[PDB]
Design brief:
The complex is a heterotrimer of chains A (109), B (281) and C (121).
Chain A: E1 4-6, E2 10-13, E3 19-25, E4 33-38, E5 44-49, E6 53-54, E7 62-67, E8 70-75, E9 85-90, E10 97-98, E11 102-106
Parallel strand pairs in A: 2-11
Antiparallel strand pairs in A: 1-3, 3-8, 4-5, 4-9, 5-6, 7-8, 9-10, 9-11
Chain B: E1 9-12, E2 30-40, H1 54-58, H2 60-69, E3 87-88, E4 106-107, E5 109-110, H3 120-124, H4 129-134, H5 143-148, E6 165-174, H6 179-192, E7 204-209, H7 235-241, E8 251-254, E9 258-264, H8 266-271, H9 277-280
Parallel strand pairs in B: 1-7, 2-8, 2-9
Antiparallel strand pairs in B: 2-6, 3-4, 5-6, 7-8
Chain C: E1 3-6, E2 10-12, E3 18-25, E4 34-40, E5 44-52, E6 57-60, E7 68-73, E8 78-83, E9 92-98, E10 114-118
Parallel strand pairs in C: 2-10
Antiparallel strand pairs in C: 1-3, 3-8, 4-5, 4-9, 5-6, 7-8, 9-10
The chains are: A mainly beta (109), B alpha/beta (281), C mainly beta (121).
The complex binds a molecule of 2 linked components (NAG-NAG).
Amino acid sequence: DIQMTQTTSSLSASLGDRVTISCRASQDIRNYLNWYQQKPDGTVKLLIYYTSRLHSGVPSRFSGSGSGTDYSLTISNLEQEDIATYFCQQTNTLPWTFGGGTKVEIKRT
Amino acid sequence: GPVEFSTPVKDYFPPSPERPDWYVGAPVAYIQQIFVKATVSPWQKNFLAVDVFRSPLSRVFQLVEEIRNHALRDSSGVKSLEEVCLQVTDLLPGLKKLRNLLPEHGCLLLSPGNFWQNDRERFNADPDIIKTIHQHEPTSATLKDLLFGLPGKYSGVNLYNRKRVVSYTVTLGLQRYDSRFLSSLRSRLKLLHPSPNCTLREDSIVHVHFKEGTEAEVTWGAEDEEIWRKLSFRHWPSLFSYYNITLAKRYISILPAIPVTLYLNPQEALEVRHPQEANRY
Amino acid sequence: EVQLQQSGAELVRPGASVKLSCTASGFKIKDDYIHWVKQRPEQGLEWIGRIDPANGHTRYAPKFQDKATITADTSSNTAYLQLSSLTSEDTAVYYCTRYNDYDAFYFDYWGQGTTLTVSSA
Ligand SMILES: *[C@@H]1O[C@H](CO)[C@@H](O[C@@H]2O[C@H](CO)[C@@H](O)[C@H](O)[C@H]2NC(C)=O)[C@H](O)[C@H]1NC(C)=O
């Protein structure tokens, strides 16, 4: 019912750089947005919940912000371990909807 | 047999005149306290003593609406508060003087907002909060204690508050126990109003059997644990007697309290003032 | 130490029925909802459904009402997802997960994922 859209499906960055993923909800979701990371191996891991809250064990370089329909994840300093796909899930209206993932990669070709 | 609780474990405490003899049936009601601490954190000169508590008290109406309208999204059972809370119909035929001060029909829910019929407009048109609160003080528990949920000196609603932190409570009486709904309510309140370093215990239910210049900060400590224990002995029997409910041979179950923290800014602290209290104080 | 071990890769014919399994360790499935999610490349992730093992009460997205059937055995501490009337569009990775906060509803822990392939070969 609620459609979540991530603007960029791919993003190129460099070590120590500030990275920003963004996604937009089709309607108000009242800050009920969670951010997940999926490795190329396939294992998923919760990063953020309720749009700003860090899940225990997540490095502090991750942060979240946003409201209304627009939300954004931020990586303060891209680490080599932060190469993955990032998904935003809305838990406002009952059928949970995920946003198309955004891949993060190193600068080359 | 007594109702079953898995994670929160049982505890027994009868006020004097494995399984005690009296812990047999279901409780008359479960008691859920939402314990609110509030402060106008950036303080200034030129603020009057009343500004210490008026703006914090003005949030009780929105908080009560939030609690009453809470719905458990993705529920496998009880969804809303109305499906689980204790229903009251009429006060005693005598003692109707407490009309529009205690809930007659529907869910049993008490809070300071009851002094103004849960009406923010009526609160805004009130020039003397202290007078309104103390208008019915004289024994049994007082109306102020019943509505605030705290002894009264802990509340901080007074003209001599030096720490400028005001505490009150919203009291819910529940006919049924639902772990999912209650955990959802706690999670909602702690998401909306995070507490800085709240250390309140959350794993014990107490069964009670009645026989016959700088910025201020909100702190949570051992003095806030089991705050209900510092209410009067007659507090709960007197609350329930107003609705023709007797706790003589039965017991009640008090659940761990849900903390709430409110930080208010000078903009709200100013927008809330009633123009006629500037001249007095 | 919370883990959600999932079964191995599955290969089945179209029109058959599969039952993927997910065994919890470090916690009792009775204590939380168990959810199944579907990842398909070029479509991303999507929610199938969940079960409350204490009640046996399941719920699904409207896409999977007639496709998926979620169940749970508390004694074996294992949740199951059954797919029926399989087709090529069921070739995907299926994740078993849960949530732990009942207002935020975030999936804190995930299984490694089970690949399901539907081909005539
Ligand atoms: C308060 O409730 C009690 C319990 O119902 C009432 O006491 C008795 O209730 C039974 C049940 O209907 C009646 O058959 C008895 O006649 C009641 N006895 C007395 C002495 O009242 C009691 O009446 C209720 N009080 C009020 C004010 O409604």
